[PDB]
Amino acid sequence: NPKAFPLADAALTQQILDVVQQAANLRQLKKGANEATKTLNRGISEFIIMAADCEPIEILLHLPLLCEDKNVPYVFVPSRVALGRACGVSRPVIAASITTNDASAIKTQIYAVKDKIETLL
């Protein structure tokens, strides 16, 4: 019944935003949908963070089918402007992607949020 399914709760969203801000410092966060489709086609996408309040909703909806196609996780976060500050960006962000880079400082927290993403879906 919901097309914006599955949506993530607020403290889990704050853990997700801390992962996203840590990855934006880490430069492994490849931002937006245009980088997202390339990360999912090349096979480097670890998972996706998406905000459901965008206009319209389905401009990110390539990522749920795209993510089930390549065993990649995804979530729905409620906030777009808090996700914009999570990217660090003065403009509101509704799409971000977690990638593969062995030079990681957040190598374990990525899987820590991915576990509760996979438990959600």
């Binding site: 749920p64 089918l65 089930e68 196609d69």
Partner: protein
């Protein structure tokens, strides 16, 4: 036409288009590319796949069962399932199921007497989700090809303990494992397990 972008070759005879076997996309294809002794997929018999999301692997199973054999795909998800629907709208062997295989008797009239089963799912109850298929549909002395993903079933424990635990789970169910494989350089920390559903003469 390619089914997911792999490169296919063509020969001529007094045209055959062979689809190449990407081993990284399919743990069954990695199991062939690692090397096997006795493969339960056959050029004539009927075979059941569990965990056929789309035709990353199950189209090649439809090829290897050929104009004779038929492949019963089992899945649940809508969006790769629809790909399997209209990707089965060209090959006649393929028929998918959209039912959860935790109760395989919910689709029990839709297949009668399959001979070979393959396991690709990520569920932690992998032995039970195969055993509810092989206790009712599998032919006697028809084999099971497991594909074990150790980080997805039980990830807290050690590496070999997952496979050595599931093999005893199979041996509880008259599923004697013929042989084991890991397929490391194609996929890191995985396994495939070849056994035959014995049911008569387990020791």
């Amino acid at each position: 036409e390619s089914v997911y972008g792999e490169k296919r070759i063509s020969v001529e005879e007094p045209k055959v288009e062979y689809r190449v076997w990407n081993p990284f996309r399919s743990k069954l294809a990695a199991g062939i590319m690692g090397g096997l002794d006795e493969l339960f997929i056959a050029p004539g018999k009927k075979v059941l796949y569990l965990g056929a999301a789309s035709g990353t692997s199950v189209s090649h199973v439809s090829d290897v069962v050929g104009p004779e054999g038929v492949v019963y795909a089992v899945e649940f998800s809508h969006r790769p399932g629809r790909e399997l629907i209209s990707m089965a709208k060209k090959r006649p062997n393929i028929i998918p199921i959209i039912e959860d295989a935790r109760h395989p008797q919910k689709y029990r009239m839709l297949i009668g007497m399959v001979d070979c089963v393959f396991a690709d799912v990520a569920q932690p109850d992998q032995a039970r989700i195969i055993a509810l298929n092989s206790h009712m549909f599998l032919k006697d002395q028809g084999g099971v090809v497991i594909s074990i993903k150790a980080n997805c079933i039980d990830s807290t424990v050690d590496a070999e303990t997952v496979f050595a635990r599931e093999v005893q789970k199979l041996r509880e169910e008259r599923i004697k494992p013929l042989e084991q494989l890991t397929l490391e350089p194609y996929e890191r920390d995985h396994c495939i397990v070849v056994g035959r559903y014995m049911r008569s003469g387990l020791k």
